[PDB]
């Protein structure tokens, strides 16, 4: 027989991590692996139909994606849906697939609103989620002995679908659910300048441990403002939630990184300012299979899509799709091994959830809620040469923290600053 896979991704724009120009080679490699493996769907072939989720302007919209999904469902009636990645585009599509009892597979859409299975049933997320970042924050708080208060700041920028809103809300809800501590939050505009002054005036009265969701340039400007104001690392600590590693170019294998220098004439001050800043990023795979997959992915993408891919953690986004696709196929086989049909949905989704799988990224696990557990990394600056390096990794499967080559997380004073000063705010 034939198995139909429906893809709803931007087929023209090549600026999103889930763009077709970067996902298509991964899907082709997954299909080739499935064909070369007699264990996965013997005697069956897999097809693929494509649809656009962008308007005439070329950005993902919440109007074109549901229409494309409806048209694909009416014309082809597929068994599974791939994508989209944008939350506003994916939510109506997810609801439509839940109503149609058609399984949905995605690696994007990490908003907390997808965490309820009563509404978004039969939906699997094989990519990173914002709740695992909350788990990492809770684990770090437990390890470092902070139990009283925290502060959260996020920046607003026109043009994107509120990237720093969903992450902050998900992390904040997860921290409240798991740690039971008093947490604050605030939004600021990075385009304005008086907003920075107001932030530096109001931060000392609201807490000492601060998480920031903004651009690397905004983070550097804020750090310089804090340094000139009088803020020091002996009382304050700053965390930057750069998941994809933009301040540190790529976030790839070991190499000296200096994010505080750009030749603006004030690198000396920025080097001293960055002594109180740490970065939280994703964890890159280490096995050589990931490197081979990256090589083949880049080669095939260059030859077949006229696109030149770079090195970075963004490449971890399409690969997950690949792995997820493989997992789905396995589940289907199990259904076909138990006297079922490929048009059930519930059995396949239940078999996928709470399972351990092996892929190019490594050994992944899907819990009972159908959310892949992700590992995290914490970067720290070398006190000798002033270069950032990886010092701590967090495994979400066992929920554990491990150092790298015996590296010690240094502090300006000697031990982490207290969460609340003895004199209070």
């Amino acid at each position, epitope marked *: 027989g034939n198995l139909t896979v429906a893809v709803v991704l931007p087929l023209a724009n090549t600026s999103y991590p889930w763009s077709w120009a970067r996902v298509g080679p991964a899907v082709e490699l997954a299909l080739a692996q499935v064909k070369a493996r007699p264990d996965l769907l013997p*005697g069956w072939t897999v097809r693929t139909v494509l649809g656009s989720s962008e308007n005439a302007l070329g950005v993902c919209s919440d109007t074109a994606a549901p229409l494309a999904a409806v048209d694909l469902k*009416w014309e082809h*009636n597929p068994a599974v849906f791939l994508g989209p990645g944008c939350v506003y585009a994916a939510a109506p599509v997810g609801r439509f697939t839940a109503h149609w009892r058609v399984p949905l597979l995605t690696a994007g859409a990490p908003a907390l609103g997808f965490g309820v299975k009563d509404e978004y049933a039969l939906t699997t997320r094989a990519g990173p989620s914002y709740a695992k970042l909350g788990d990492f924050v809770a684990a770090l708080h437990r390890r470092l002995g902070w139990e009283r208060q925290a502060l959260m700041l996020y920046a607003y920028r026109p043009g994107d679908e509120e990237h720093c809103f969903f992450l902050v809300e998900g992390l904040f809800m997860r921290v409240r659910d798991r740690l039971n501590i008093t947490v604050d939050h605030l939004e600021f505009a990075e385009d304005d300048l008086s907003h920075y002054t107001r932030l530096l005036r109001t931060m000392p009265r609201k807490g000492r441990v601060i998480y920031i969701c903004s651009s690397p340039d905004a983070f550097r400007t804020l750090m310089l403002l804090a340094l000139e104001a009088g803020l020091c690392g002996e009382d304050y600590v700053f965390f930057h939630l750069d998941i994809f590693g933009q301040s540190l170019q790529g976030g790839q294998g070991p190499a000296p990184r200096r994010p505080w220098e750009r030749g603006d004439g004030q690198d000396v001050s920025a080097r001293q300012a960055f002594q109180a800043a740490k970065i939280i990023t994703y964890k890159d795979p280490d096995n050589p299979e990931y490197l081979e997959f990256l090589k083949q992915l880049k080669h095939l993408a260059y030859e077949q899509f006229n696109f030149t891919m770079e090195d970075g953690l963004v490449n971890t986004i399409p690969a997950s799709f690949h792995d997820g696709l493989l997992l789905y196929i396995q589940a289907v086989t199990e259904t*076909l*091994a*138990h*006297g079922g049909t490929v*048009t059930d949905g519930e059995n396949i989704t239940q078999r996928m959830w709470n399972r351990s799988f092996q892929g190019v990224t490594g050994y992944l696990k899907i819990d009972s809620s159908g959310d892949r557990e992700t590992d995290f990394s914490l970067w720290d600056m070398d006190p000798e040469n002033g270069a950032f390096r990886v010092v701590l990794n967090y495994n979400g499967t066992s929920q554990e923290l491990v150092a790298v080559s015996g590296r010690k997380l240094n502090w300006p004073l000697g031990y982490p600053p207290p969460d609340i000063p003895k004199c209070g705010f």
Partner: antibody
Amino acid sequence: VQLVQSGAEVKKPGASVTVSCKASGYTFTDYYMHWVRQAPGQGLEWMGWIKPNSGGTNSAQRFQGRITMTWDTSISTAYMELSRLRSDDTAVYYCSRGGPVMNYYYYYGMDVWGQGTTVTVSS
Amino acid sequence: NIQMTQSPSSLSASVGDRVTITCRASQSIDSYLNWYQQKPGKAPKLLIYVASSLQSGVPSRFSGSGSGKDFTLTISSLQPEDFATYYCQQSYSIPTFGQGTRLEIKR
């Protein structure tokens, strides 16, 4: 390839009925087994099917409540048990084989059919 | 589920004529369709196994075609033994049977 059925009993509503289907002449554990019922004047009506080698079963939403299908590979026989019979269960039953099990070709049509058995429910 | 419709409900034709029957599905099915013929007092017998295959032991005068939501069954030349009730069944999902199509002679 042969398919032998036996039974024409009539009984009061609320009792149970058992239908046996014999599939001698071919490898019983190499094909699916479909049970299908047809009303006297309505038309054909798919009931369910079983897969012997993997021990799998599939039934309709409106029939899964009170039907039980089993098999015996020693003599290559299939048994269908229906309970909570009402006045709407007076019909003709057929057992058929179709679709190999080495490859999951469950969409193959039913090749060999049975003679059929008549079940009447009345007090 | 998928509801299946047959056209026409009844048709009268003579011997040696061209006859077509149309089966329509409420949802799109690629090639999952089977055709069965049934005579009174006898079990159904299979004729076409995909939308366009041809089961062993079937005369070549029967043909099947179509795809998507519409399929056609064609008999090039009717014979006195070709008058029976025809059913089109879908196998992509939980199988369902059509209402039937009775064929009779012309008088």
